Amino acid sequence: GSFVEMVDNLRGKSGQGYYVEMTVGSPPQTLNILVDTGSSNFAVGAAPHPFLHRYYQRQLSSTYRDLRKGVYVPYTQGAWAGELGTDLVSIPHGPNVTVRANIAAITESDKFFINGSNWEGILGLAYAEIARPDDSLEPFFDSLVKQTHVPNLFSLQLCGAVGGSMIIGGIDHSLYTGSLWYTPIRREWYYEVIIVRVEINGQDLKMDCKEYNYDKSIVDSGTTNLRLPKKVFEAAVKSIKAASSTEKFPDGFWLGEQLVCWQAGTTPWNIFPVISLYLMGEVTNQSFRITILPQQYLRPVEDVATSQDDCYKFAISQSSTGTVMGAVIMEGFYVVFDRARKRIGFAVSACHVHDEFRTAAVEGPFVTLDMEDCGYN
Numbered sequence: 491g492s493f494v495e496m497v498d499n500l501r502g503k504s505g506q507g508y509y510v511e512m513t514v515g516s517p518p519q520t521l522n523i524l525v526d527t528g529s530s531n532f533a534v535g536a537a538p539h540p541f542l543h544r545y546y547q548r549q550l551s552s553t554y555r556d557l558r559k560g561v562y563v564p565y566t567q568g569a570w571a572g573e574l575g576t577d578l579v580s581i582p583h584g585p586n587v588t589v590r591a592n593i594a595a596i597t598e599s600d601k602f603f604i605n606g607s608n609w610e611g612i613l614g615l616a617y618a619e620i621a622r623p624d625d626s627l628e629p630f631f632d633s634l635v636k637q638t639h640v641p642n643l644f645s646l647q648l649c650g651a652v653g654g655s656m657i658i659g660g661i662d663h664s665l666y667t668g669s670l671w672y673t674p675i676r677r678e679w680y681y682e683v684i685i686v687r688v689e690i691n692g693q694d695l696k697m698d699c700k701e702y703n704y705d706k707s708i709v710d711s712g713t714t715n716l717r718l719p720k721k722v723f724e725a726a727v728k729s730i731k732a733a734s735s736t737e738k739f740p741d742g743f744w745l746g747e748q749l750v751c752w753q754a755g756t757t758p759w760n761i762f763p764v765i766s767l768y769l770m771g772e773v774t775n776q777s778f779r780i781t782i783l784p785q786q787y788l789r790p791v792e793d794v795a796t797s798q799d800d801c802y803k804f805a806i807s808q809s810s811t812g813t814v815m816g817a818v819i820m821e822g823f824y825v826v827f828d829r830a831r832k833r834i835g836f837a838v839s840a841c842h843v844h845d846e847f848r849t850a851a852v853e854g855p856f857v858t859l860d861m862e863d864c865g866y867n
């Protein structure tokens with residue numbers, strides 16, 4: 491593989507996101523940056539903070555240029571304020587290029603930096619339409635493609651229990667098995683896609699597909715869980731509960747309020763159903779589906795101290811938008827963000843967490859009519 495030096499360039503915690511090393515300024519200042527396909531701003535801590543091991547020191551960078559404008563970014567969980575500017579940026583374990591990119595220097599924040607997360611910034615990989623202050627602030631990837639010959643495409647292999655790979659400018663065939671199935675990027679703001687069908691253990695949830703995408707369905711490496719619209723979430727939980735009747739769990743478990751732990755190496759994965767999401771294909775009336783295992787939607791909680799107990803939290807929750815395909819979904823696959831051809835590809839990951847009975851899968855093609863009517867106008 492020609493992209494071998496980019497393999498395993500991501501690190502992280504089982505629910506605190508994946509980050510890549512990025513070198514900023516001159517002389518070099520390397521920091522750990524979160525890879526987020528759900529946002530579009532490149533920002534780094536630039537002032538002391540109890541949860542920051544290190545930060546960007548603008549005064550020490552001779553190539554830093556203050557844009558003399560402030561920026562504020564409120565996320566679904568947390569927010570920060572900073573100063574806009576530009577500086578030289580490189581990804582040591584990424585493409586062999588250096589570009590001058592917009593960079594937000596975070597000077598104040600609220601519930602942003604986590605105690606012992608190891609990351610000091612965030613790399614928004616989505617489009618300009620959702621960038622702050624507005625769409626005039628060119629996102630990092632856009633600068634990369636405009637300033638260099640690096641192809642307009644990147645792929646993510648997020649491996650769960652953490653590490654992974656972000657391949658920029660191409661596809662690394664060693665990171666997946668089987669074929670890559672593509673779904674259209676509906677609009678270029680978030681990485682919006684269209685879900686046309688949902689099954690629990692092969693059983694169709696039988697809801698109007700418009701409910702699956704009400705508002706918008708997206709692929710977001712920045713969100714941990716698989717988030718579903720309220721009406722869809724309720725139906726899905728009812729079905730998952732029925733399919734896992736071998737054992738009973740408290741209501742709060744399905745609501746993510748309570749956790750359930752099992753003796754080390756005794757989690758009854760076989761009692762939980764597989765979940766399949768059908769995505770619009772590239773050909774008229776054609777779709778494909780991705781199937782995830784409970785090992786994906788049941789995530790391990792920060793262990794106490796190598797104790798003989800494995801605690802898990804239900805990683806499917808309620809969303810106030812359409813379906814948000816977070817890390818729990820992506821961890822089972824190699825995901826190709828083919829911006830050049832406005833499509834997202836899915837293939838079984840070479841690091842998919844499965845067992846001897848079942849495995850994550852990407853299968854097709856299937857015949858699905860009126861898929862267009864599933865999207866929100």
Ligand SMILES: COc1cc(Cl)cc(CN2CCC(NC(=O)COc3ccc(S(N)(=O)=O)cc3)CC2)c1OC(C)C
Pocket residue numbers: 505506507508524525526528529565566567568601602603612680708710711712713717808809810811812814
């Ligand atoms: C470890 O923590 C993080 C890891 C990573 Cl990589 C990135 C971030 C920030 N990132 C999270 C993802 C978010 N995505 C959307 O905003 C997409 O649009 C949505 C709209 C509605 C909904 S809802 N209301 O229905 O749930 C959900 C999503 C963008 C911001 C994290 O936060 C830390 C503080 C830095």
